[PDB]
Amino acid sequence: MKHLEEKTLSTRQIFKGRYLKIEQDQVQAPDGRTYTREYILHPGAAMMIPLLPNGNVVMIHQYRHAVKKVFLEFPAGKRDHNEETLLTAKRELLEETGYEAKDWKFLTTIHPVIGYSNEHIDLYLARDLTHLEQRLDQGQFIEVVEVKPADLMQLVLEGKVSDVKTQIGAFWLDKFLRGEWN
Amino acid sequence: HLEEKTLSTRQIFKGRYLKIEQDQVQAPDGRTYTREYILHPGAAMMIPLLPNGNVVMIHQYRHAVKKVFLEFPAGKRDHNEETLLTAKRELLEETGYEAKDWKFLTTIHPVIGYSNEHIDLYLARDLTHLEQRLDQGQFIEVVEVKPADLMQLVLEGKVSDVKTQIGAFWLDKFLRGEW
Numbered sequence: 564m565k566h567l568e569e570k571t572l573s574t575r576q577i578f579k580g581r582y583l584k585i586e587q588d589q590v591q592a593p594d595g596r597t598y599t600r601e602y603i604l605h606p607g608a609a610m611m612i613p614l615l616p617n618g619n620v621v622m623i624h625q626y627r628h629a630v631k632k633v634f635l636e637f638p639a640g641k642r643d644h645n646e647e648t649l650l651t652a653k654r655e656l657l658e659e660t661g662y663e664a665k666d667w668k669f670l671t672t673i674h675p676v677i678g679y680s681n682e683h684i685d686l687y688l689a690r691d692l693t694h695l696e697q698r699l700d701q702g703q704f705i706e707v708v709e710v711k712p713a714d715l716m717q718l719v720l721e722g723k724v725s726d727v728k729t730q731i732g733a734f735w736l737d738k739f740l741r742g743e744w745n
Numbered sequence: 746h747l748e749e750k751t752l753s754t755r756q757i758f759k760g761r762y763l764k765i766e767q768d769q770v771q772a773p774d775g776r777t778y779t780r781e782y783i784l785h786p787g788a789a790m791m792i793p794l795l796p797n798g799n800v801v802m803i804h805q806y807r808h809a810v811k812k813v814f815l816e817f818p819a820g821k822r823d824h825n826e827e828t829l830l831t832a833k834r835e836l837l838e839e840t841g842y843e844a845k846d847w848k849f850l851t852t853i854h855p856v857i858g859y860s861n862e863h864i865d866l867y868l869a870r871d872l873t874h875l876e877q878r879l880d881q882g883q884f885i886e887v888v889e890v891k892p893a894d895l896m897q898l899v900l901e902g903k904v905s906d907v908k909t910q911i912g913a914f915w916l917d918k919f920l921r922g923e924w
């Protein structure tokens with residue numbers, strides 16, 4: 564699909580807020596003309612599906628101000644210092660929920676904002692869990708819950724798992740639990 | 746008791762396409778924090794199902810990630826119109842199709858950490874093939890895809906666009922008679 568590609572002619576960081584950094588590019592498109600492209604520069608991230616011995620998954624409730632609501636999510640966070648995302652996933656599982664896992668499996672990489680961010684999220688399945696203690700940052704507010712996967716799938720259908728990364732996790736888990744994808 | 750209360754708001758950035766809101770909020774610890782996110786108008790995406798059982802999809806280059814994606818057609822809400830209007834227009838502009846049977850599936854939030862974007866996903870059936878009407882700067886190829894092939898592509902990591910991957914999973918549930 565080389566005939567669809569756009570070639571970068573110029574780049575600049577047009578804005579840096581408290582948290583968000585925006586790149587503004589000029590690109591040459593397949594018509595040979597020049598167009599502006601704008602996107603957030605994001606470090607990447609990891610999310611995991613932590614599957615307990617009893618078959619439930621460990622999830623969280625977290626308020627997200629950008630949408631003004633509380634979401635049911637799988638634990639996740641941003642990639643720090645360009646680390647391997649497996650390290651990101653281990654740290655975030657520990658900090659957000661207090662769990663460690665003996666068995667980690669990479670599932671897939673998703674891109675949640677292809678129109679305006681370079682963000683990718685690596686999704687992992689975590690098994691053989693043991694509990695320790697949740698360790699939250701100042702400014703981080705998280706309630707931990709156990710969810711039955713059948714109940715999760717019904718919530719997806721009902722529109723109650725609108726967070727894309729978590730919904731995608733639910734569908735990958737469903738495939739895994741049914742023995743279709745493993 | 747997780748809800749954060751807005752103390753102030755301002756639009757700190759407006760570029761060619763992106764707008765950033767910055768709020769001061771009071772959190773459950775009673776302390777003040779900054780929250781920063783993209784102001785997005787919302788969007789629709791749709792899954793156009795053909796009588797031969799294939800779905801209409803697109804290939805589109807996405808500069809933010811520097812690759813070509815397989816996507817279901819989509820676009821941004823214009824002038825706070827109903828997202829079904831958005832879906833009808835974008836299906837016609839991006840793919841050249843019209844549909845007489847539309848069904849809302851679900852609403853997703855692709856960027857809960859830093860955008861208020863929502864995308865409403867629809868299933869479209871009973872299709873007529875007219876022609877694309879692309880905007881300047883828009884480059885899209887239309888392809889026809891077998892759902893079984895799509896699901897294998899998802900497994901292989903070749904449908905990394907969250908909205909399209911989600912559409913694939915919903916379609917799989919619909920086709921399997923489960924939902």
Ligand SMILES: OC[C@H]1O[C@H](O)[C@H](O)[C@@H](O)[C@@H]1O
Nearest residue numbers: 638639640641642857858859
């Ligand atoms: O899952 C996302 C959460 O973790 C990430 O590290 C980010 O800092 C922010 O978006 C939120 O705190």
Ligand SMILES: OC[C@H]1O[C@H](O)[C@H](O)[C@@H](O)[C@@H]1O
Nearest residue numbers: 677678679818819820821822
């Ligand atoms: O699907 C997304 C596409 O459509 C939307 O209307 C936006 O303008 C932009 O992200 C892209 O051109």
